[PDB]
Scaffold this active site. Structure first.
Site, PDB file in Angstrom:
ATOM      1  N   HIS A  24       0.567  -0.964  -0.210  1.00  0.00           N
ATOM      2  CA  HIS A  24      -0.131  -0.616  -0.119  1.00  0.00           C
ATOM      3  C   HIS A  24       0.854   1.256   0.027  1.00  0.00           C
ATOM      4  O   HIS A  24       0.559   2.338  -0.762  1.00  0.00           O
ATOM      5  CB  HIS A  24      -1.243  -0.058   1.114  1.00  0.00           C
ATOM      6  CG  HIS A  24      -1.430   1.567   1.063  1.00  0.00           C
ATOM      7  ND1 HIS A  24      -2.369   1.677   1.084  1.00  0.00           N
ATOM      8  CD2 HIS A  24      -1.898   2.637   2.800  1.00  0.00           C
ATOM      9  CE1 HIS A  24      -2.972   2.598   1.009  1.00  0.00           C
ATOM     10  NE2 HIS A  24      -2.590   3.510   1.620  1.00  0.00           N
ATOM     11  N   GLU A  25       1.688   1.182   0.616  1.00  0.00           N
ATOM     12  CA  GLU A  25       2.892   2.048   1.094  1.00  0.00           C
ATOM     13  C   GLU A  25       4.172   1.805  -0.852  1.00  0.00           C
ATOM     14  O   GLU A  25       3.889   3.271  -0.827  1.00  0.00           O
ATOM     15  CB  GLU A  25       3.880   2.048   2.096  1.00  0.00           C
ATOM     16  CG  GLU A  25       2.781   2.456   3.303  1.00  0.00           C
ATOM     17  CD  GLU A  25       2.024   3.636   3.524  1.00  0.00           C
ATOM     18  OE1 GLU A  25       2.209   4.668   3.047  1.00  0.00           O
ATOM     19  OE2 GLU A  25       1.411   3.287   4.368  1.00  0.00           O
ATOM     20  N   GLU A  28      -4.884   9.262  -2.718  1.00  0.00           N
ATOM     21  CA  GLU A  28      -5.038   8.174  -1.716  1.00  0.00           C
ATOM     22  C   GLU A  28      -6.527   7.353  -1.998  1.00  0.00           C
ATOM     23  O   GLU A  28      -6.021   6.080  -1.640  1.00  0.00           O
ATOM     24  CB  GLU A  28      -5.489   8.992   0.010  1.00  0.00           C
ATOM     25  CG  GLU A  28      -4.708   9.822   0.259  1.00  0.00           C
ATOM     26  CD  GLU A  28      -5.071  10.866   1.668  1.00  0.00           C
ATOM     27  OE1 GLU A  28      -5.695  10.540   2.471  1.00  0.00           O
ATOM     28  OE2 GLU A  28      -4.743  12.326   1.330  1.00  0.00           O
ATOM     29  N   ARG A  62      -9.704  -4.216   4.580  1.00  0.00           N
ATOM     30  CA  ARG A  62     -11.169  -3.642   5.047  1.00  0.00           C
ATOM     31  C   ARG A  62     -11.934  -2.881   3.720  1.00  0.00           C
ATOM     32  O   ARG A  62     -11.111  -3.278   2.880  1.00  0.00           O
ATOM     33  CB  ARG A  62     -10.680  -2.230   5.315  1.00  0.00           C
ATOM     34  CG  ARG A  62      -9.685  -1.341   4.428  1.00  0.00           C
ATOM     35  CD  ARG A  62      -8.195  -0.373   5.375  1.00  0.00           C
ATOM     36  NE  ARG A  62      -8.862   0.591   6.404  1.00  0.00           N
ATOM     37  CZ  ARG A  62      -9.752   2.044   5.842  1.00  0.00           C
ATOM     38  NH1 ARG A  62      -8.942   1.398   5.053  1.00  0.00           N
ATOM     39  NH2 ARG A  62      -9.707   2.274   7.179  1.00  0.00           N
ATOM     40  N   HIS A 111       2.244   4.397  -2.963  1.00  0.00           N
ATOM     41  CA  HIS A 111       2.916   5.919  -3.140  1.00  0.00           C
ATOM     42  C   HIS A 111       3.246   5.815  -3.312  1.00  0.00           C
ATOM     43  O   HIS A 111       3.616   7.517  -3.826  1.00  0.00           O
ATOM     44  CB  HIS A 111       2.238   6.488  -1.126  1.00  0.00           C
ATOM     45  CG  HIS A 111       1.234   6.555  -0.995  1.00  0.00           C
ATOM     46  ND1 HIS A 111      -0.415   6.990  -1.344  1.00  0.00           N
ATOM     47  CD2 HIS A 111       0.573   6.057  -0.068  1.00  0.00           C
ATOM     48  CE1 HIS A 111      -1.234   6.951  -0.786  1.00  0.00           C
ATOM     49  NE2 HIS A 111      -0.948   5.867   0.318  1.00  0.00           N
TER      50      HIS A 111
END
Ligand code: ZN
Ligand code: ZN
Length: 1287
Positions: free
Chosen positions: A229-230, A267, A369, A233
């Site tokens: 996930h990071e 995001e 999630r 970015h």
């Protein structure tokens, strides 16, 4: 491929793969950090991130950094060499897991190859400058203790350990002079703070984590997905596309709104799933446009780059080649670099929509999630990621060799306990809101519990701007979606150009902006005397030091007394739960109170079909008191009236801009460039439509559906608390007994909890289906319509705009100025239907939408129902209803239209529903009672047709009218072409099933036919191919209009309209749902009453009636007299004849005024004989199958049964009812049913057969047969005098 290096913390510094780095935020000073090169261009520094933080911030305090996170603090993490090495070994293992699949490896390959451009905005176009903090980073080569010698290197990513909050991972970019190269196409060294051990926890809201509440619930995160996930970015930052644009900011004006940092689109793209949909199509194109512009600059520079001042050893060509591959620029045979729209598009979509958390989770079978906006929970610590017995490179926690692959069992907390540990809440910090009342009792609510309501500012107004249409101008649609397969199978996605050497000139310009962070209060005290969801949930809890509680329905007592707990369940449930019993009766009570809990919770499946609502959770308002004071009054009634809007804690203020105007460019003497400008403006119009819907959806998802989310979570809590209180009470009562008694009490708590948590789960599913229904309903009825309005307003404007254009150029169009004149009217005619699957691809949301649209009741666009001496539309589309003084109304939902001019109803329909589907597709259903014809007015009855309901607009529309015994449906399309269909009932029947009796009408309209249904049965059909467009949403006038008799009137009930064709099936059901009642009906179809005079009718002997025989106490059966006059048009039998009966109540002596007769009631069946009131009786002692009834004055005889029970053995609608004689109420001894029997009489003079008013046991078995035999002699109907029937 991607090679992952190996090493240990204590390994020697070689100045190559294990260096002494000078971090970018060190400003060329401070000490160095032992850094390890896990892969090309990527470094791991196993130390705490300290930049911008104060040493003490690393300890838990009364403050917090991020308001929306349960922050964990532990200053000892990584404080020893062995701890640092364990970090290295974990990072190495996480990277290996990452590249274990094509997708993950390509992500890594894109990152390694996505080297920052050499320089930023400041650097002259013609140059390459490596001496900037976002391109170069120093390593200390020289001996220990002396920074005497430095070597520079190129880098793409440096990963540090966690800053103060361990579970707060972050990718950080380098800003220099208030600008970020990573946001302007260049890219730059990216940094991260990451923690593999302490991972976040979450739980699928609309589901049960291991179907457990009394058990640990939710799932914990796979650190490899957290890392990727990071890494996404980083990918964005490296490609310089981490642009900023209009952010999603939360409204914080109310105490119940959730406070949080602005959320950028980048995001939401990274998370993926539905979140992208929260970014309107307007901002999507903005962001796209900024990025493309960013690449234009880079592509221009590549054409001008000539030297590199900072480092003479840099090979300009090798770098122009690398960059050309990075940004997928194209090059001609000369070396001219230019942007290829195709290649750019695919690269852009790959980076913003291919590589997302959701796509990556799905691909690595990792669970995550369900949305960016989902309550955050306390993180858990992962025991040992280095033990292949708990976490493997190939499967993570879901190791199949442990039956942990299926259903994400390995991440399920209630299942994989040997894989994690909970954390000391003493080290956790949570931002709370202290809700205080002006006194002062206060409650703490975690910011995560409040409602996230996006602020209006969050949305773009770009729709309200003018747009120049030209022969060029084209459609601009950005697909917030990507085919992950092709990405994984992409041949030229991953560059094959050699990566430049990382060694270069040392950095001397350490200029850089370093962020400064600081904690803020973890508690914000507010004042409010409101008692909403937070207060109501709170009233259902109790202190840890308390073990003796009692339930109460009184919210105020629950808040006052600590030993009192609020309950939204029944009154009986509450009494039984507080009941104390003998040890010998404890087991029984446990079974009972538990069973009761399940019953109460299961009331969540309540239906409300009569009010056209298939599902309603009655206790939701009592449980949460959310929205507009829903805990008061009857929730169901309140919901019927105002709908979903009542559950919302706040009604948003939508952004629905007036679509800006169009500027068509004229090309004098030009057939093409002109026709084009037309077609393009037409298609552009469609983009405005699609785009406006996107804006709606984005708002729905972040201001409405988020509130309903909170409500669903509130209910999960509420239910759990109740289960916990009952649990607490059961334990208490049990432990009050001695050990001796306890030994003889058979009880199993795991079981109790099982039955309880089970009932909770059944209710949760009901509640979720219900709430999603409300969310989709609000979107469709309260939002989409407000957009459609503006979009229509826009259309008209554009209509005359294009016509006025096709005119000014009439000349240059010549023989077509009239062809594309209509071509315009035929396009701006059919409007774009809203379809959610366009604006999102989230499975859950699509299902919500499809379910909504499958339920016929949602096709109701008008539903007139009675409420407080008035009629109102309850369809939820806001129809304005005007009921004038001449309309009579009652609570049986019946309304009467008289001959008076003021006896009318005006209904202004909602113009914003996709009604005009172009071929007329809709239905109208209603009940009607049409009076009998006056015998002397028979000529005018059969001659005068009079309208009763008219709905016209521009001489087009529909109408319902009446001509005598005929009801007619008339349609008039825009061309004035008229068509009709009608239902006419016979008026020469001895006994009519329709004249003056309530009946159900339903008319359906599709492209081919017009059908009229009567009581569910199809009666008439009319081919309506011809009939063109029919304007059906004009004003609706309910009024008798025509040459009528002053006495003419019509009663109506349940008038409603559907914008679709109802099936025979739908109609049959509606008839049965609206016919349903707990009371019986009279002959006309109205409720049966007590103390009301009625003549009796027998469905088995239509032309018969009862008369008290002169000589004997028996009722003889005589033939009804008939219509006496000579009209050829009419015939009937008299109804007002025979004895006049009156039904008297048996129980409770509350006088003899009047009231309703309900099925199964015990009554006396009396009648009037002269001035006296007599009664119907049965001689108790007969032995034959039947006998004649005994009719005589009222009295109490030992030899006669005088009590009757009114029945209803027919399952289907009917106005007939049966009368049963039993030995006595309680008994099960059925004496028989009242009917009519034929006897033979042979006297000295006469010899004939004669039917009498009897009672027979024979009927007892006939009434059970199916289908129900309506012709039985035991079926009766009561006929009272009615102004609608004169003879
Ligand atoms: Zn993120
Ligand atoms: Zn949130």
């Amino acid at each position: 491929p991607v090679t992952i290096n190996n090493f240990n913390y204590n390994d020697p510094i070689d100045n190559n793969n294990i260096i002494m780095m000078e971090p970018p935020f060190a400003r060329g000073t401070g000490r160095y950090y032992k850094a390890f090169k896990i892969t090309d261009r990527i470094w791991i520094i196993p130390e705490r991130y300290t930049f911008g933080y104060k040493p003490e911030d690393f300890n838990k305090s009364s403050g917090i950094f991020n308001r929306d996170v349960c922050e964990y603090y532990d200053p000892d993490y990584l404080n020893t060499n062995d701890k640092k090495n364990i970090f290295l070994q974990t990072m190495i293992k996480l990277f290996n897991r990452i590249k274990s699949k094509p997708l993950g490896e390509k992500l890594l390959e894109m990152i390694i190859n996505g080297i920052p451009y050499l320089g930023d905005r400041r650097v002259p176009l013609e140059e390459f400058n490596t001496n900037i903090a976002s391109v170069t980073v120093n390593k200390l080569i020289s001996n220990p203790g002396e920074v005497e010698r430095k070597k520079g290197i190129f880098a793409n990513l440096i990963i540090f350990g966690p800053g103060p909050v361990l579970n707060e991972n972050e990718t950080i970019d380098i800003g220099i002079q208030n600008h970020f190269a990573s946001r302007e196409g260049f890219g730059g060294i990216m940094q991260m703070k990451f923690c593999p051990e302490y991972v976040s926890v979450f739980n699928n809201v609309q589901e049960n984590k291991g179907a457990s509440i009394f058990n640990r619930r939710g799932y914990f995160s796979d650190p490899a997905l957290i890392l990727m996930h990071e890494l996404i970015h980083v990918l964005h930052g490296l490609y310089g596309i981490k642009v900023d644009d209009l952010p999603i900011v939360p409204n914080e004006k109310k105490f119940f709104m959730q406070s949080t940092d602005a959320i950028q689109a980048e995001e939401l793209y990274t998370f993926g799933g539905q979140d992208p949909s929260i970014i309107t199509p307007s901002t999507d194109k903005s962001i796209y446009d900024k990025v493309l512009q960013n690449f234009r600059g880079i592509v221009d520079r590549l054409n001008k780059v000539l030297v590199c001042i900072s480092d003479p050893n840099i090979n300009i060509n090798i770098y122009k080649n690398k960059f050309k591959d990075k940004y997928k620029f194209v090059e001609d045979s000369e070396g001219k670099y230019s942007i290829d729209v195709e290649s750019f598009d695919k690269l852009y979509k790959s980076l913003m929509f291919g590589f997302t958390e959701t796509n990556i989770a799905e691909n690595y079978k990792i669970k995550t999630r369900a949305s960016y906006f989902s309550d955050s929970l306390p993180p858990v610590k992962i025991k040992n990621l280095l033990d292949n017995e708990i976490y493997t490179i190939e499967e993570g926690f879901n190791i199949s060799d442990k039956d942990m692959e299926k259903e994400y069992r390995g991440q399920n907390k209630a299942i994989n306990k040997q894989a994690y540990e909970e954390i000391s809440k003493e080290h956790l910090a949570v931002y709370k809101i202290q809700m205080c009342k002006s006194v002062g009792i206060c409650i703490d609510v975690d910011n995560e519990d409040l409602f996230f309501i996006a602020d209006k500012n969050s949305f773009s107004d770009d729709l309200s701007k003018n747009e120049r249409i030209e022969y060029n101008t084209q459609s601009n649609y950005i697909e917030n979606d990507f085919p992950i397969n092709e990405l994984i199978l992409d041949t030229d996605l991953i560059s094959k150009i050699e990566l430049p050497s990382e060694n270069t000139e040392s950095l001397t310009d350490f200029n850089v902006d370093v962020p400064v962070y600081e904690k803020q209060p973890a508690i914000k005290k507010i004042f409010t005397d409101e008692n909403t969801i937070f207060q109501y949930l709170y009233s259902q809890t109790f202190p840890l030091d308390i073990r003796d509680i009692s339930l109460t329905s009184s919210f105020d007592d629950a808040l006052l007394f600590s030993n009192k707990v609020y309950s939204f369940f029944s009154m009986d449930y509450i009494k039984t739960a507080n009941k104390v019993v003998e040890a010998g009766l404890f087991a029984g009570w446990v079974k009972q109170i538990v069973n009761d809990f399940v019953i109460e919770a299961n009331k969540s499946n309540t239906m409300d079909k009569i009010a056209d609502i298939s599902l309603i959770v009655p206790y939701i308002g009592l449980a949460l008191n959310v929205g507009n004071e829903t805990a008061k009054g009857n929730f169901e009634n309140a919901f019927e009236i105002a709908g979903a809007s009542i559950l919302l804690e706040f009604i948003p203020e939508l952004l629905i801009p007036v679509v800006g105007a169009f500027l068509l460019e004229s090309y004098i003497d030009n057939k093409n460039k002109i026709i084009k400008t037309i077609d393009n403006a037409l298609t552009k119009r469609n983009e405005k439509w699609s785009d406006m819907y996107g804006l709606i959806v984005a708002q729905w998802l972040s201001t409405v559906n988020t509130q309903f989310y909170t409500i669903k979570e509130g209910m999960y809590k509420a239910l759990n608390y109740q289960a916990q209180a009952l649990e607490e009470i059961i334990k208490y009562r049990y432990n009050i007994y001695s050990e001796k008694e306890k030994s003889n009490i058979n009880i199993d708590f795991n079981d109790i909890n099982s039955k309880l948590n089970e009932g909770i789960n059944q209710a949760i599913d009901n509640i979720n289906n219900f709430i999603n229904g409300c969310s989709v309903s609000y979107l469709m009825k309260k939002m989409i319509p407000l957009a459609v309005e503006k979009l229509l307003d826009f259309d008209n404007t554009l209509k005359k705009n294009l016509l006025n254009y096709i005119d000014e150029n009439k000349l240059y169009l010549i023989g077509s100025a009239e062809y594309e004149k209509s071509k315009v009217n035929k396009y701006l005619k059919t409007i774009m239907p809203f379809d959610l699957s366009i604006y999102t691809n989230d499975t859950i949301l699509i299902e919500m939408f499809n379910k909504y649209n499958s339920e016929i009741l949602n096709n109701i666009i008008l539903n007139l129902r009675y409420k407080d001496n008035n009629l109102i539309d309850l369809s939820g589309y806001g129809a304005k209803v005007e009921v004038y003084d001449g309309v009579e109304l009652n609570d049986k939902n019946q309304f009467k239209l008289t001959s008076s001019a003021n006896s009318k109803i005006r209904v202004t329909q909602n113009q914003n529903i996709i009604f005009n589907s172009v071929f007329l597709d809709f239905s109208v259903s209603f009940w009607i009672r049409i009076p009998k014809y006056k015998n002397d007015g028979i000529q005018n009855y059969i001659h005068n047709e009079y309208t009763i309901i008219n709905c016209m607009k521009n001489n087009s529309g529909w109408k319902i009218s009446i001509r005598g015994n005929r009801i007619i449906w008339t349609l008039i399309d825009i061309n004035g072409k008229t068509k009709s269909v009608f239902f006419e009932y016979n008026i020469r029947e001895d006994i009519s099933e329709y004249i003056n009796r309530w009946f159900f009408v339903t008319i359906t309209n599709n492209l081919n036919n017009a059908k009229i249904y009567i009581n569910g049965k199809l009666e008439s059909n009319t081919d309506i191919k011809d009939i063109r467009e029919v304007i059906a949403n004009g004003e609706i006038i309910f009024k008798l209009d025509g040459d009528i008799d002053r006495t003419q009137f019509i009663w109506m009930k349940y008038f409603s309209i559907f914008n679709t064709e109802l099936s025979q099936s739908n109609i049959e059901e509606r008839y049965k749902i609206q016919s349903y009642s707990e009371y019986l009906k009279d002959f006309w179809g109205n409720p049966l009453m007590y103390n009301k005079e009625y003549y009796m009718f027998n469905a088995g002997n239509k032309n018969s009636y009862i008369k008290l025989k002169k000589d004997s106490p028996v009722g003889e059966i005589l033939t009804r007299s008939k219509y006496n006059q000579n009209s050829k048009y009419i015939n009937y039998r008299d109804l007002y004849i025979g004895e006049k009966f009156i039904i008297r109540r048996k129980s409770n002596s509350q006088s003899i005024n009047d009231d309703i007769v309900r099925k199964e009631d015990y009554i006396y069946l009396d009648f009037f004989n002269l001035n006296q009131e007599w009664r119907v009786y049965t001689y108790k002692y007969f032995k034959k199958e039947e006998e004649k009834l005994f009719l005589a004055p009222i009295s109490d005889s030992d030899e006669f049964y005088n009590t009757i029970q009114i029945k209803e053995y027919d399952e289907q609608p009917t106005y007939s009812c049966q009368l049963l004689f039993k030995k006595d109420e309680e008994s099960t001894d059925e004496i028989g049913l009242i009917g009519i029997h034929r006897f033979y009489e042979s006297g000295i003079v006469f010899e004939e057969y004669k039917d009498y008013f009897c009672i027979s046991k024979w009927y007892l078995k006939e009434v059970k047969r199916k289908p129900y035999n309506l012709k039985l002699g035991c079926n009766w109907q009561f006929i009272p005098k009615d102004e609608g029937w004169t003879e």
